[PDB]
Amino acid sequence: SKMSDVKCTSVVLLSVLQQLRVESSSKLWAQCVQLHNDILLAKDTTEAFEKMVSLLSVLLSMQGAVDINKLCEEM
């Protein structure tokens, strides 16, 4: 299962972004929503992975909101 793990990681990733109060910045939430809905309606895994890169790079863009060195440490 490779196509349907990116379609579920978009759901988890947009839930994380929404919990970090991305949606108080409307120009950013419009692009995050558009990337989410484009991944979910995708039939080719390459374009889904490019949109997933673009969407995840919103989460990595905000510095102190996550603690990436702690979350990635356990893996």
Add this chain to the structure above:
Amino acid sequence: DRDAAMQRKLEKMADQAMTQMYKQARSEDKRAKVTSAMQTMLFTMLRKLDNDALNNIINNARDGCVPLNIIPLTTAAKLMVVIPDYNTYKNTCDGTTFTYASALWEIQQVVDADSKIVQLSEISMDNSPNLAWPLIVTALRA
């Protein structure tokens, strides 16, 4: 049989008490740790995909090389990533090419934390302590 009916009623009320207490405890515990559980779940799923672009942007974002905007998809669009230390510059940049998100980017412009423009010839193993880190690299997709 009257006493056994009393015992059955008591054990049925005990059973409902066990079920209702468990449901309340588990539900309030799940609704409390929702942020941390979701973030841990997300990074588990991201490691499971084992993509070679997601891994690259995450392994850069651990070190401190995070983008300042959304990574673009179009050919010849603009990405501004902060590079904190010279070694992180050495790992990602070569000449003027810039290997990020498993894509090659052409560096346009490197500014400092004091917002002064900087040429890519100043970035040296020796001159770097004279720089004002963290650089902001503006690059364009190849």
Add this chain to the structure above:
Amino acid sequence: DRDAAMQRKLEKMADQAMTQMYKQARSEDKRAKVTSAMQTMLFTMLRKLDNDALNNIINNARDGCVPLNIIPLTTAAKLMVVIPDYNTYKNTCDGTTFTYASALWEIQQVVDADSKIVQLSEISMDNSPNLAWPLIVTALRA
């Protein structure tokens, strides 16, 4: 047996009547609270009227009835324009005064979709990308 089961039935019924009396008291208290809330809402919306122009147009009707859709359009003091992009902004309320509903309005504020204030020197064709559209421009009747 007769008397004890009688008193058990009796006290069950009395507790039922007490519970329904509690329910009636709660319903009537909540009805009082909702009537208070509706009355204060109506009286604040009374104080918010613009009674000069409203009296003028109501006394200018031949029956005393005017359609509701032209109560704001001729008596409102604030006009909120919601604008989705830049061409619409250039066509409807360019500059600090404009025209709508056969009056002249003076722009007192422009906020964006984020409730942030946007200065009128921002809204240009090259800074149109960086604004969080739609723009809510609040104007006053001159």
Add this chain to the structure above:
Amino acid sequence: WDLLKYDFTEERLKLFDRYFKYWDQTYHPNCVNCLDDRCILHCANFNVLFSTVFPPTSFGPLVRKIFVDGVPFVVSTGYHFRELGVVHNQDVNLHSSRLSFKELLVYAADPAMHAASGNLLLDKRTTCFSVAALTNNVAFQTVKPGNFNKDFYDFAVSKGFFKEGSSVELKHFFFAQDGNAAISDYDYYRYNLPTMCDIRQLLFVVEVVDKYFDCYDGGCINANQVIVNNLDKSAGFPFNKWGKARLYYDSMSYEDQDALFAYTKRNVIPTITQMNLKYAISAKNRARTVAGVSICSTMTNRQFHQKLLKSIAATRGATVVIGTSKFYGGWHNMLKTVYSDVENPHLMGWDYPKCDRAMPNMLRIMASLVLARKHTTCCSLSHRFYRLANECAQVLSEMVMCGGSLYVKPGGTSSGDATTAYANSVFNICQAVTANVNALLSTDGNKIADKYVRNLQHRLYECLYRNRDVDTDFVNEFYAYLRKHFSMMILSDDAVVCFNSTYASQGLVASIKNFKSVLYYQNNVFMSEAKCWTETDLTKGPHEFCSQHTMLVKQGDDYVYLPYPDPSRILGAGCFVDDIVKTDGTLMIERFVSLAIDAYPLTKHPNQEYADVFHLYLQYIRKLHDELTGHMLDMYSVMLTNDNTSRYWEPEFYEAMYTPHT
């Protein structure tokens, strides 16, 4: 035009005498003068045409400055409908002393105060006419994504699902929406145009549709006979600022509800209706909105329509299958009463694009005039007119509140009133009968070989365009023809038709192309033939009705039809839940019992990857219960003494839901 001019009766009469001068039937510009509910369709159909030459600001309520104990209110004492003309209230109290609960409810519901005391608004995001902006800043409402249920997904890929090239794949997700959703979805009311209907034909299709609604019974019911299903459902605007509908069904004693309902039969109460964004799983990423109608409208419409609307849901075997369950052999019985001895059956199913937004005002008025023909004895004539005006002011062309701003809804049904599946069913039957009338008239006439049917075409044209009085002999005869050769089954817009195929090939009964034509000139939408199916082989049943496919299985000893869902829907309801606590699983075993009840008939499907969805849900219920008793043995040290969850993972508990015994 003069801005305050609201009474265009003389202009309508001048227009009617300039264009339709020799049209001999009387035209009452204000429909409050009309004689029955077939002179309301006539004059309403004319006012639909004429009211497009009058300024759009002059429709809507008519406010007037009244005084309550010396303080001046501005409240609405009428309405000026585009279809119904000018309607004046009859109980207006220019000097009142105090406000009871009924009068307070009326004055808070109606939009005269709210629009009259808000900032003017000019919303360029839409084309719909915008009235006012109550708040100082418009509200942008998002729709969050759904929560992932990772335990179930890892169980599903552990059982070998979701691989590449699977026949079962996730297509039903929770789509998120950015800020401008509610106002980019309300904007779809731009698909609603003012449609004049062919009035000599609508006044016959009304009689045939009324024949379809003949077996039921209805009337006004008192306030103590009204049954509300769920009372914790919000009460529209502005009443949701102080409580649910429980509060307004508890505060008003039955005298105060009967008084409000007897008030709406002599008065018009305009009403604000919210547009709520829906948060539910769907296959396509357009936002879905539901119009939450005020409790002042829902209460009175419940009392008016509840007896008929609860006698439609309690009749089995009719055309309108609302209230017939698909469980316990109900789907087999629905599918056997569709095939009521049509001669060479083909099944046919169509699809209205934008059913609730393109639907003209004339067909919604026809639906509300057919649901109100049951009041021949309980209501007078003017009572039925003022109930029609109250429906057209609270439902059809109301003030929609879309994110802190009052807009004018141009027309077409709002999906949240007290009669929406049923008014939708009346509209659906009307379009099928209109398609048959068009298909029968538009055939040549010399080519019609069957001498009975050619005489039926002749009598049909004569009863349409050459009579002014309803001809109950021919209305009964044409309804018998439609039931003999065009049997239908209707659930609010999902229709399955079992038409005679020799006839529809010869042109004597509506095929698909007749519905395409009818929806072109009477709905202003183009129904693309890639959404209408035709099933020539009856042993496969309807290809899709109410989103359940149908298959003919062997059960007990005989063959039955069973409904099975889309497997992607059932897996999407497993994997994506709309609340965080539903992710836990062990708390929600009833959720998986219900999903397995819905996904049971997939076991008899021949595609094996479909039939594994049921056993996936059974094994997941077993695993959930095993880990539930594991945790409830850790939290204590005694397992539950009585535990009857052992039957939710046997297939007999589920197969008992589709056998006809109960």
Add this chain to the structure above:
Amino acid sequence: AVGACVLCNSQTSLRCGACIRRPFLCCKCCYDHVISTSHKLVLSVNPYVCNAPGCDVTDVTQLYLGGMSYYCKSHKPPISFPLCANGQVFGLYKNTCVGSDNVTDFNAIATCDWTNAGDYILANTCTERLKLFAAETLKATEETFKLSYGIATVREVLSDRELHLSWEVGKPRPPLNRNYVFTGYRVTKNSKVQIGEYTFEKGDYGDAVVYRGTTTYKLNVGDYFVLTSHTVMPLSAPTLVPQEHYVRITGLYPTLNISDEFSSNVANYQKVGMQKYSTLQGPPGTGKSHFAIGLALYYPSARIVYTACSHAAVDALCEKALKYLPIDKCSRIIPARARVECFDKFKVNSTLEQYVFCTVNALPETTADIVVFDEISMATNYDLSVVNARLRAKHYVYIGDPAQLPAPRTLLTKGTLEPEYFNSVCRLMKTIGPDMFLGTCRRCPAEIVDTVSALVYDNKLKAHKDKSAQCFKMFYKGVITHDVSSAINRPQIGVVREFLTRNPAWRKAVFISPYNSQNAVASKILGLPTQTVDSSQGSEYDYVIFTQTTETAHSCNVNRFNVAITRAKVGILCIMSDRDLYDKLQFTSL
């Protein structure tokens, strides 16, 4: 209400009932705790009392579980089973629990009354969750000791700013200073109502208790005063966040050409960057509180919170930041109550500024990029736990010296606490050695360093100064009077008053005396700024007038004396009481 056992972190639902803090306890650990001590009350989701109509049995060894309630031995239904059995008190998660052996230490922590010398050394070498629990129960004991003080009642109102008080008979008088706020009452028939939060100070003449108040009420005869007690908030964060030696600097960006003054401190700045938390130890006036400002000027993009336990330590830090740091991007936090006046030159109560300053108790829940905790000698594990719960940051720098004077520990009366028990960090500086060390007295004249590098720091200090000839110390016995508990010495104020007409340049000197009451009472004779030795730690002065009041164990404490005499930047006068200490220093005779 589930939780985690303190000494093995298993899941559990019990709580010991006789312990003041109600620590969660697993089943086996709760049996070990209730079978050895006298703590026999346990609370589950409901208490373990006997649910008879009337019965008082709480001892968990006695009760039985029957039906859905816990009954004593004489009310049990025949379907019942004992709780305190099999070595495990029955609670939730009974069979998923791990026993422990620390119940020979947890008993001593939860049982003791914190008066002896050993309880603090046991509260500081246990595990981390026991360190938090011990700090919490010590705070609770110190709070409930304040209920043992007397109750005041007004006898007459001599003046609107001069009450007259009589205290309860047989109960000890509280000490009268602005730490202890009282509440008024008028409880007669007629209004058992609080009439304002007051605070006292003993006026110089007469038995007048000059009161400050929140309100503006007239006080009658019958108004009577009760001390307020503050509830101890429970604490969660560890005392020391675990260290992680990085490979290279993270989160901090160094600077080009920092200054010529902090040029010799660059190596320690790189060390602060490399570690997670670092500890700095130096003798007084040797650049420690200066180093924090140098950390500010070496990582200019780094948002910093400076913290201390006093208010004069954080005010000394505030002054140093005023001299060096940009004053627009700085702040200062003052609590709303604020019985004492603080430093007011920064934009007060604006925590979003890049350089926040605070007392550790009044911190707001925020983040940082390096947090500097100055004066760790005055910190208890409650304070380090609070600073680890509120402030989330990338690097921690704990600055201070163990040889100055500690947190007072009011309950401690029998024994002496060595430095390595003051808190965890002072233990770390006295166990493995500090990470950074700077000893060279850059503040005090070489006479002060010459006499203070022989008392505590055994000949390890040399000064960047010389004998400045303004260090006078005299020996005058000073016949004492006694205040509530803080003695007052009139004739030494007399000789200081003599040393103020006859030395004009010294009228900017600061008075330093070990007792708070004499510090208040020598302002009305002299008029100099006044500071107590305990609250003077970290701020220097040009000239200092120290007066040893009494010959006791408190004012003849060599650490208190050291922190008294190492604050004079250029000149000091020391009116001594003890003969040996007056011979220990080497000043002029006077």
